[PDB]
Write an enzyme that holds these catalytic residues in place. Sequence first.
Site, PDB file in Angstrom:
ATOM      1  N   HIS A  28     -18.149  66.600  33.268  1.00 27.86           N
ATOM      2  CA  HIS A  28     -18.096  65.947  31.974  1.00 27.86           C
ATOM      3  C   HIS A  28     -17.565  64.521  32.035  1.00 27.86           C
ATOM      4  O   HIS A  28     -17.663  63.799  31.038  1.00 27.86           O
ATOM      5  CB  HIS A  28     -17.237  66.785  31.008  1.00 27.86           C
ATOM      6  CG  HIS A  28     -17.228  66.271  29.603  1.00 27.86           C
ATOM      7  ND1 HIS A  28     -18.383  66.030  28.889  1.00 27.86           N
ATOM      8  CD2 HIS A  28     -16.203  65.917  28.791  1.00 27.86           C
ATOM      9  CE1 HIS A  28     -18.070  65.560  27.694  1.00 27.86           C
ATOM     10  NE2 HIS A  28     -16.753  65.484  27.608  1.00 27.86           N
ATOM     11  N   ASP A  50     -22.905  69.811  32.771  1.00 25.86           N
ATOM     12  CA  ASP A  50     -21.704  69.453  32.021  1.00 25.86           C
ATOM     13  C   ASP A  50     -21.312  70.667  31.187  1.00 25.86           C
ATOM     14  O   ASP A  50     -22.030  71.035  30.250  1.00 25.86           O
ATOM     15  CB  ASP A  50     -22.004  68.250  31.123  1.00 25.86           C
ATOM     16  CG  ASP A  50     -20.779  67.734  30.392  1.00 25.86           C
ATOM     17  OD1 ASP A  50     -19.832  68.511  30.190  1.00 25.86           O
ATOM     18  OD2 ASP A  50     -20.773  66.550  30.003  1.00 25.86           O
ATOM     19  N   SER A  58     -18.026  60.097  25.911  1.00 19.48           N
ATOM     20  CA  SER A  58     -17.940  61.219  24.983  1.00 19.48           C
ATOM     21  C   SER A  58     -17.538  60.784  23.583  1.00 19.48           C
ATOM     22  O   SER A  58     -18.262  60.021  22.936  1.00 19.48           O
ATOM     23  CB  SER A  58     -17.003  62.303  25.526  1.00 19.48           C
ATOM     24  OG  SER A  58     -17.257  63.565  24.907  1.00 19.48           O
TER      25      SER A  58
END
Length: 267
Positions: free
Chosen positions: A245, A216, A94
Amino acid sequence: NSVGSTHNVTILGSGETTVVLSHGYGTDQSVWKLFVPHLVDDYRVLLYDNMGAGTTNPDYFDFERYSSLEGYSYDLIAILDEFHVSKCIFVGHSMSAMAAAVASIFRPDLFHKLIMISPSPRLANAEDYYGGLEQKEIDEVVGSMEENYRSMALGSAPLLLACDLESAAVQEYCRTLFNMRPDISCCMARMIFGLDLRPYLCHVTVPCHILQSSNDVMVPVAVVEYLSKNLGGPSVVEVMPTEGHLPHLSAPEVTIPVVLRHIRHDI
């Protein structure tokens, strides 16, 4: 103190090519514990903790520096230079993947390719853009984490991970989330929710391998399609058959073979 030391840098294995493993929010370098054994035989594995992780000293957490993603990009550059890295294979989760994307604009010499697990250039909705969350919901979340940090961390963990409350994944994620000082954690969350890298994707030219879960809550599939479309260099998107996620944490049995394939094979 060197930047490596203050970020708890670890070198594992040995090889001509360096694989950098960079954890995301709420975790530390221990998130990679099940991946490392598959890499050490063939690669020099460099891991480190993002400043603000619970394993790092608050004395080094500069609230202004880390309220913008470039503070993390600059730390990454400094650590790689301290280890004489050239053209590494970078794996991030991320916003640590997005920090490397930014770093690669400044210092493309450091990166052969970026492997980005569940990345987004902007989590907040904008005009003509669905990121996943309205600004008002972000305000509520950040306000809630100020109110009861640990209650919110536990309440969100199963949804973020797509895992049951009693799972090893939730237990491990809460352990590191709860290890962060709440004010530092909120500062990092505010930075993450406020980031907008959309204008800068065209300047990223290193090859990017985007690994996306099948569901997600933070990253709608159209967001990774948008990211791939707008990156300035080669990119590929692979949707993996697991949800959540943090698929590297919740589903290593799915995510490790995918990550290994993207490490071993260029676009």
